[PDB]
Design an enzyme around this catalytic site. Structure first.
Site, PDB file in Angstrom:
ATOM      1  N   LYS A   1       6.432  -7.686  -2.230  1.00 50.21           N
ATOM      2  CA  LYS A   1       7.588  -7.094  -2.872  1.00 50.21           C
ATOM      3  C   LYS A   1       8.778  -6.989  -1.989  1.00 50.21           C
ATOM      4  CE  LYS A   1       8.806  -4.788  -5.494  1.00 50.21           C
ATOM      5  NZ  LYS A   1       9.621  -4.003  -4.586  1.00 50.21           N
TER       6      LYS A   1
ATOM      7  N   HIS B   1      11.053  -2.280 -12.454  1.00 48.13           N
ATOM      8  CA  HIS B   1      10.886  -1.069 -11.610  1.00 48.13           C
ATOM      9  C   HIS B   1      11.569   0.111 -12.312  1.00 48.13           C
ATOM     10  CE1 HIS B   1      11.920   1.278  -7.756  1.00 48.13           C
ATOM     11  NE2 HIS B   1      10.617   1.451  -8.001  1.00 48.13           N
TER      12      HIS B   1
ATOM     13  N   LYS C   1      -5.679  13.389 -10.166  1.00 48.33           N
ATOM     14  CA  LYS C   1      -5.382  14.187 -11.387  1.00 48.33           C
ATOM     15  C   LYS C   1      -6.687  14.818 -11.886  1.00 48.33           C
ATOM     16  CE  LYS C   1      -2.684  12.415 -14.459  1.00 48.33           C
ATOM     17  NZ  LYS C   1      -1.519  13.327 -14.535  1.00 48.33           N
TER      18      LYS C   1
ATOM     19  N   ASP D   1      12.539  -4.342  -1.390  1.00 48.42           N
ATOM     20  CA  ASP D   1      12.872  -2.927  -1.450  1.00 48.42           C
ATOM     21  C   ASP D   1      13.892  -2.702  -2.558  1.00 48.42           C
ATOM     22  OD1 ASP D   1      12.918  -0.257  -0.931  1.00 48.42           O
ATOM     23  OD2 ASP D   1      13.959  -0.396   0.996  1.00 48.42           O
ATOM     24  N   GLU D   2      13.799  -1.545  -3.220  1.00 45.57           N
ATOM     25  CA  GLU D   2      14.642  -1.295  -4.387  1.00 45.57           C
ATOM     26  C   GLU D   2      16.122  -1.275  -4.021  1.00 45.57           C
ATOM     27  OE1 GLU D   2      12.005   0.634  -3.529  1.00 45.57           O
ATOM     28  OE2 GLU D   2      12.581   2.743  -3.325  1.00 45.57           O
TER      29      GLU D   2
ATOM     30  N   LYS E   1       8.176  -1.834   3.043  1.00 42.41           N
ATOM     31  CA  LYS E   1       8.948  -0.638   2.681  1.00 42.41           C
ATOM     32  C   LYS E   1      10.022  -0.163   3.656  1.00 42.41           C
ATOM     33  CE  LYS E   1      10.554   1.494   0.372  1.00 42.41           C
ATOM     34  NZ  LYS E   1      11.087   1.836  -0.974  1.00 42.41           N
TER      35      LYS E   1
END
Lengths: 439, 73, 441, 439
Positions: free
Chosen positions: D174, D267, D307, D176-177, D148
């Site tokens: 992954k 994404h 939640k 990074d966007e 990240k």
């Protein structure tokens, strides 16, 4: 039209159909009307020199055993057909002749293709002698099997059964006719899993193995895409259906295989709608001749291990047409014309149906070591599984081939050969307890 | 193989399976088959503990005339 | 077990079929039906090789045909997931690939099919249709006319084009080519195309109306078939022609796809069909092959004249004409319709009449088909005692005469002979033709 | 409009929005104005037969708990939409309805797509069952991680961290966007170094590993160039952003993956601008349905751990829409229509955020073994380095799977199952000292 004094030339196409005229119509008049309703459509020179562009009846015979039955003979000029086209040949000889009302039933039987017309076709891609050299198999008939039932299986599980059967000793493995691309299994990922199993089974036995991949599609752009992907993976053989896809699409596929080194397998589906009745349709021996010119290596022909005299001669008759090079006239076997193929490659016939181990001596003696034998429920039905099931079939076959090369009648000595063989193979023993002997 | 005015297979009475004669519906060898290979008290050598095999007359169809019990023609 | 479920209810996503059967003496009828559903699918009635369950077909109804003791109708339903989208070959391969080789029967014949809307939406259909073509041709209110050069044969390209030019200037709209003429030593195709194109422009430049001519595109290979279609597009021709029974469905679908993308019209000629749908107990009825073409693609199709049909007949023809043209058809057992069909806004197909017809048959043809068909004349145009151009004028003058009367409240049925005679008085070409062809009374 | 007696047919598209009319506007007249402002734009037959080309309101309900709130229902004809286009569906239903000045707030909630319209789409490239066969992983959820923060690292150093994490026991890695192509690291040489590390880690463990490569670009010519280079190196998966790139570009990428055998990861960026407020925008459950038709294999959903009741049902509700085949109506879970997908492949959900070892029993029990779990600081923050951090996560996950296969409850034991496991693993022990227990 009827010219009984006419003498056929060396460059003419001949045909022979049987007719059932309505009560009243004289036989000699009906024959001349079939030759005209096939070419010009008239008996006068009013619209006309044309003359030579027409057909003619030159012979009429009465069929024995039935009073209302005759055989007619028609001759056609050579300049009426386009070179290299099979579609044009059918649309000209038969475009509207079964709609004639003055008759009740019609059936085409045979055709003679002169050597001056056969030289414009390509023919089978490889043939018989060339194919055996690519596989390095001599002496005995080849073996195969087909995953028939199942359905709904995943791609992973579909490739599991292929690996088991090939490792047991079989040579080929088939697919199912009605499997092209469906929501439960797509075509691209089925090709990937099948090719993986072929390579694995080739490293344990050191023999060449294959599998027929279906290439039928709804469009010609899609059909050619599936054929090119089979070449990248180095697959040796493909499959097509030539009666529901058409003749135009079949010729395109044959040319591609010749230029890339692939084998073609042909399946005959929907054929029963045309050639089952005895008084209407087109005989199968005519469609076999058209397939040889268009292109192909294998073809289905059906088993005869369940026929009697009178029969077993018609089927034996057109088997020679697919393999020989010069066939003489013989009316007792359903051959009306002498045919010369001027050095064209042959086609390997395929026999199928519900067969088992006790049928080994019968098939070997009739067909010889020039055919392919396919099994359905006789391989996947073994009580021990798939791989032991394929071992039983191989054993039995070798036994018959050996006995034959020692002077032992396979027509009588047969149940004996099989029995003495189940005295050193546990797998064959078990199989000989599920299926019964042959009187 | 059919039955009175019916395409049903008699041998299995429309079932597609038959009982294992060797174990006689038991599931274990009773005699020493294959001389020195199958004992006389081990798992059945044929069914292998199921006491049920496929019918030969019909290869699991239940009826006669069909493409799983006929010579191709 | 489901095999023969006389209670099962069908769903909105199922394909249904109906065949007539002739069982051998001794076979119970309720058991033969279940065997047809198995030989057309799995091939077994037991769960030994089996979840499969839903991947099988089932019979749910049986009726006895009145008038014959040995005749029945069977109904079979098939799941949707058994077919590939957009393929017509797969449907025919799956439904009937091994069903007529069965021996427990004597004769079988498929009659009708039902296609759910969830399956018809994956096809393209006709390239243009009916309404769009009329806007392209700018012709309204009356049926179209055409002619074919049936006999002849062996003529040179120049003589072939001369006849087309003479016929097109008389008043006709279309012109056809012989079915068995693709490429032969006496006449090749690349020059026949050129001469036809040369004649069309000269014919068009005088009368100020749009004309056309069907050009044959059937070939032995798909590479050659596509070469003859682009040349017709280069010259700006509006229509082509293909045979869909001796060529196959695979080659026809590609041609339809190409024609959609370039603005051409497709004419379909049915051939060899007499080998399949002639007998009353074996084969496939023509109304199924008619439904197949609409999904595959096409604009014109040969159907069959009906004025020679009597009571009992003329009903099935009017039924499948409605199936070809309409959008919603209800069930009617008296017209050979067994299922309710919905086409969810698919274009229609124009039917074409043909055979041996002349001027005295005009009112009957106009009354029955309506102004939504094409009439083709054979020997009734080139047989005129004065030539071809005077020959076309008689047919043109006659057609208009019938339409006008119709729009005034006259009965084209009882009358017709009178109507024709009144026009001959002021037309010499209409006369003479009435001295060669006699009138039906 | 307002036609209460109207009965919807099986080929209609239905929608339901909530409305907040201004003081004075009666509720029944406001509903009919929405159906018109969405189709024709009139209530009279002056410009006109058109008739059937319009929308209609057939139901109105009052929302409990709030006096000024209602639910409306609208039906649309089938012939109003273009086959195979998702862009046309959105531009027709909502092209100008939120600009209406007679209302104060509007929100679309749900849609129903008839099977007669879904059959014209391709759907996900592979699905769920096919994907698991390509990776040979069964019985447990998959694991992953994402580099990240960092930023500014060289290409050589970027591939160093990838190799360490994959060797520890993880499955995916992954990117990074906001990393496409920048002066400090170009895209071509980053692909080369990443592919080198994948091959090395595959020879020590003998398991299939992968890494998501970003393929977003500013032009369609550039986006397709980066996808073809990933096929030459034999990479298994790519990544795209479908909310800032558009729907037209996403459909083009889905078709390419199906024809070449690649997996797609999706994404959801910028989504918070549309579906955060309770009275204006489009609910996320609608955008999830559009993604299934367009194409995709993975998608981000969100950790539902933190939640409470009332919630944790809306989320569980639309998870079933992405995996099941037949969903029934249930208003307590936010489902207004019954949906049938007529045998369409499913989509794997992905959960992320700040998670650690003590959150392992919770995620496994809720989602099941049909999801992907991603970690950020719960891997790179280990006091011993990167490779040991991936061992901890791998050890903890296997403990939970076994317990459930014994009858032990994961809603209670939890803390226990973890402790006993940190009694034979030194890495887990150290990790259990940085993060705190879960009450």
């Amino acid at each position: 039209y009827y010219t009984p004094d006419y003498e056929t030339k060396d460059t003419d196409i001949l045909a022979a159909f049987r007719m059932t005229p309505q009560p009243g119509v004289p036989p000699e008049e009906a024959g001349a009307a079939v030759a005209a309703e096939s070419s010009t459509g008239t008996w006068t020179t009013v619209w006309t020199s044309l003359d030579r562009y027409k057909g003619r009846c030159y012979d009429i015979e009465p069929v024995a055993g039935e009073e209302n039955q005759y055989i007619a003979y028609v001759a056609y000029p050579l300049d009426l057909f386009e070179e290299g086209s099979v579609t044009n040949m059918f649309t000209s000889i038969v475009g509207n002749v079964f709609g004639f009302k003055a008759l009740r039933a019609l059936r085409l039987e045979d055709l003679r293709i002169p050597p001056a017309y056969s030289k414009t076709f390509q023919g089978p891609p490889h043939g018989i002698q060339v194919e055996r050299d690519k596989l390095n198999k001599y002496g005995r008939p080849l073996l195969g099997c087909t995953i028939k039932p199942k359905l709904g299986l995943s791609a992973k599980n579909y490739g599991r059964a292929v690996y088991e059967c090939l490792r047991g000793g079989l040579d080929f493995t088939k697919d199912d006719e009605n499997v092209n691309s469906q929501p439960f299994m797509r075509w691209r990922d089925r090709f990937l899993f099948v090719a993986e199993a072929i390579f694995k089974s080739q490293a344990e036995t050191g023999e060449i193995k294959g599998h027929y991949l279906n290439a039928t599609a709804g469009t010609c752009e899609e059909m050619m895409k599936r054929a090119q992907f089979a070449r990248e993976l180095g697959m040796p053989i493909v499959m097509h259906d030539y009666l529901t896809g058409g003749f135009t699409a079949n010729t395109t596929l044959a040319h591609y295989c010749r230029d890339n080194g692939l084998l073609l397998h042909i399946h005959r589906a929907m054929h029963a709608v045309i050639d089952r009745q005895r008084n209407h349709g087109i005989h199968f021996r005519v469609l076999a001749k058209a397939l040889r010119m268009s292109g192909g290596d294998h073809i289905h022909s059906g088993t005869v291990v369940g026929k009697l005299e009178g029969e077993r001669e018609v089927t034996l008759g057109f088997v020679d047409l697919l393999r020989d090079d010069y066939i003489e006239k013989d009316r007792s076997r359903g051959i009306y014309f002498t045919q010369d193929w001027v050095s064209m490659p042959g086609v390997l016939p395929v026999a199928s149906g519900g067969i088992h181990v006790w049928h080994m001596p019968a098939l070997t003696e009739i067909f010889g070591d020039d055919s392919v034998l396919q099994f359905g429920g006789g391989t996947l039905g073994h009580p021990w599984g798939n791989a032991p099931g394929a071992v039983a079939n191989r054993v039995a076959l070798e036994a018959c081939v050996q006995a034959r090369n020692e002077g032992r009648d396979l027509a009588r000595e047969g149940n004996d050969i099989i029995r003495e063989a189940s005295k050193w193979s546990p797998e064959l023993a078990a199989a000989c307890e599920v299926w019964k002997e042959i009187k | 193989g059919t039955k009175p005015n019916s395409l049903v297979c008699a041998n299995c009475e429309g079932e597609g399976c038959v009982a294992c004669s060797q174990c006689k519906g038991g599931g274990v060898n009773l005699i020493d088959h294959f001389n020195g290979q199958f004992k006389a008290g081990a798992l059945c050598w044929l069914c292998r503990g199921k006491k049920e095999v496929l019918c030969g007359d019909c290869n699991g169809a239940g009826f006669i005339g069909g493409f799983l019990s006929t010579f191709d023609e």
